[PDB]
Amino acid sequence: SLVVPDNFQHILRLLNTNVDGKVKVMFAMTQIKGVGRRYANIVCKKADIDMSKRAGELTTEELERIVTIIQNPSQFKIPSWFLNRQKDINDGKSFQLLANNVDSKLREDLERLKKIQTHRGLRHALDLRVRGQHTKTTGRR
Amino acid sequence: MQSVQCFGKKGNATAVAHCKVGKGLIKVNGAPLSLVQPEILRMKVYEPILVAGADKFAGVDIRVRVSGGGHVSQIYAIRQAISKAIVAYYQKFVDEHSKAELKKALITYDRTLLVADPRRMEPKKFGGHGARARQQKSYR
Amino acid sequence: QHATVFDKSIIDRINKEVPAFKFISVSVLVDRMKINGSLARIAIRDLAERGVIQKVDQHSKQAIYTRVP
Amino acid sequence: VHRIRITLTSRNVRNLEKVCSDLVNRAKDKQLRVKGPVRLPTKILKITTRKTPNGEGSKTWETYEMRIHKRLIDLHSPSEIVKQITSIHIEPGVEVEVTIA
Amino acid sequence: MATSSLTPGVSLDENGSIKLFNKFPFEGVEVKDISLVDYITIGNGQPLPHTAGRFQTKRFRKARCFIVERLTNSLMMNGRNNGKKLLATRIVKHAFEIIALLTDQNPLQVLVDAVAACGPREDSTRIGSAGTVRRQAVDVSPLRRVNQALALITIGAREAAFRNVKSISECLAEEIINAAKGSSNSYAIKKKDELERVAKSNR
Amino acid sequence: TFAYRGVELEQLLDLSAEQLVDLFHARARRRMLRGLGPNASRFIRKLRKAKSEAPLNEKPATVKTHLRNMIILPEMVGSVVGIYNGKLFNQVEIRPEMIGHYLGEFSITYKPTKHGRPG
């Protein structure tokens, strides 16, 4: 139903991460940190690329347009209610979470909660659960 | 006139029919006997039709309504309802010997089509979720 | 592992290997060749409109096909 | 024009039947379209509780039952006969109510 | 002849052909292996394996149950699927039609030969009561032979298809065809041989 | 110049109440949406007394109360309050950095962890 002798260029570096070459695009995009399942589906649908083809047959123009749409989701008529981060603490806007930035956002949030010295902060320092859970029988080892 | 009525149950399922004189037009709740909710549960409904053939059914018009029970309960109810409706029609409007041979033929090849099925679930007793199943004792 | 590179060989192979067997489905083609699942049903669908395979009874999980005779 | 509907709710089967028989007999003594008794589904309330005042002991649960029975009667009687039959139908344990409009 | 309802001629032709199975003949199949007659209802033709009836009320009421139904009942294993008869019926139907596609003979005949060959002849019960806790060679009844064959076939199919691409129906069909004949590639036959050899060893 | 949403601390000190209640977490903003110091208005006024009495120090003269279930607000921030954790009026030293969270989220009431392990 599709052209068999197509182009393949294995994997490529993307957002300081590796996107699988011979793998379905839905599976491959989950390798990028900060990407789920519905998020991957909607961004690809808004990027308007053929779903049957995998990530190994994509071209430079399609790859660049897809990532730019991901870099600027809200500008491309992507609804803001879906966005993971809305009304950021520092930015003050509904900034989109990525892979390279979340590699340091977790520790940035940790220092945010530790410098101000909350009860949640000492729970994080002592490696205990922060929600009102129970550890009398569970939460062991 | 020539018409009878009957019903059929398999526990918490009921199916009441209304026989009439006609030239076919056999259906099960709007849809015909061919089209039903399941697909692997079709021959169960077809069980009493094939035994006597369709020539005897060419002179009867029956539409049966089904209400209550699960999928297997409903298909058993409708096949029981149509079978008892047919034998009621042939008991009241054709020779007794013909009814005797039809009922005997149905009895010989009977998946509880005519005889009622007294199947019920025993009440749940305290001490466990099931009537007989009980929570395990730590014995120590 | 199962290969998925469309190197022009799989399409010709399956088109010349369908007459080898009668029952064609995902379970048997996995044994026949290293097929990753997508082409498993895509190729069957693309060969359905051809007279090589005759349908018998289709289901959501699998469909039954037979040869020309 | 003036239809009288009276309630026959109670729990004692014998006394509600006696009240129902009395009004039906009067409705047959004087022809008022001779509308007979009407029976409603039983409203049974099921409650399950424990038996042990404390927590020690085996898991035993006691289930109690509370059922009530309702009947309705429609009559074409005039006001004077309606007030008369209600006067003679004073029985213990029977609750009656008449709706006019 | 037809009525307003479609009434496909397949059902009429099936009735004309003394009500054969779903897609296989019923007249012409019998148990050929000796010592297992009067306990398998091959002649009892039923359009569907399922039959919601009483199969345990009597001591030997189980002997009159349909062999296909008993196998679907055995396939009801794995309490994840305890109670899903529709899945078992579809698997059995798919296995039976695959067997017919593979070999031209009646899949019911394949099934009867398979259970007959798998059924153990000599077992070894335990004497118990402490002491030497040895075992003695004992023969078994035909009804228990069918029970062992059904259980061994089902457990072998589950073990074979527990983690693999092949479908449960395909694995069940492969087990049935491999057990109907002597190829030494059947897990049920292997357990049959193992039970026989340990029984002769402790005899 | 940045406490919760990047708006400057001086601006928060006299910002619009609706804007302040709108720049918070849904939980932390529904808290002030439905409850604004129930009987704690006296506590707010008493803190205003402390600010007027001792503005020279970052923490004015200590003032006690018996309630912490409300988040901190810019017009009341910058003081020390005595809160009964059960046997002691803990000094709390409210700071404007964490505007939008209760006082118990930052103080200690029960023995948290570590099994104690005395000697």
Add this chain to the structure above:
Amino acid sequence: ENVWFSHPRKYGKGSRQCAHTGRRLGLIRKYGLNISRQSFREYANDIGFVKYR
């Protein structure tokens, strides 16, 4: 006429109880009974809760 003595309530505990009970544990409000389980057991027959089954 007393301030900070008895706090008025409209929901939760401190709003409903029985005439001679109100332990709030092991108490049913079903059908507006508002009585303890032990009292219900003692006077079940008088109300009409008869162990038919």
Add this chain to the structure above:
RNA sequence: UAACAGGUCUGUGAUGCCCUUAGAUGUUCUGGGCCGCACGCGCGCUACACUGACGGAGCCAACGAGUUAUCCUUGGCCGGAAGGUCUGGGUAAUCUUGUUAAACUCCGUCGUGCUGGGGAUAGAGCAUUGCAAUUAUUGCUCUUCAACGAGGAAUUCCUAGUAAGCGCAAGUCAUCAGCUUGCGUUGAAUACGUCCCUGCCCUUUGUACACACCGCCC
């Protein structure tokens, strides 16, 4: 029928006795709590995958509850079904309600790899219930999305609509089911045997036991 030295003096204006009563072992308002953990033991739950997951679509039950100020909910409309809007049905087999359920089935994908099976665990906002939800009630939009890859020795329940699996109703409730009590659907194999392991009754017999073998005694 009798036996437990069984539980409940924290259901009980049911109570005998000991103690206290003003700096009250009396009433009451606020904060911390019964839920606080380097562990051992329980009763139940989740997946360990294709028998599943996702996505559309045809649809098949029962028992039960509800406002006198203040509960069960329909209809047009707005929405991020999390809410709120206004006329409104219901003191009741007349309104929720015919509690169009789940399981199932027609079709497409995930192809067998701790992955799109499994959501332990961490973060940001969206609403109702409640002087008000920190020690996140509850669900919601998401992201990070791990152990586990049918579990040893031991041990528990089960004889036909039985186990098993699934869902629903009610209890406690201002809110919150992973518990309990009932209902219905899908629906099996195994025995019609025994005292062999583990106990209960009867008869005979023996006894230096009689708080009675967890006994007496050298």
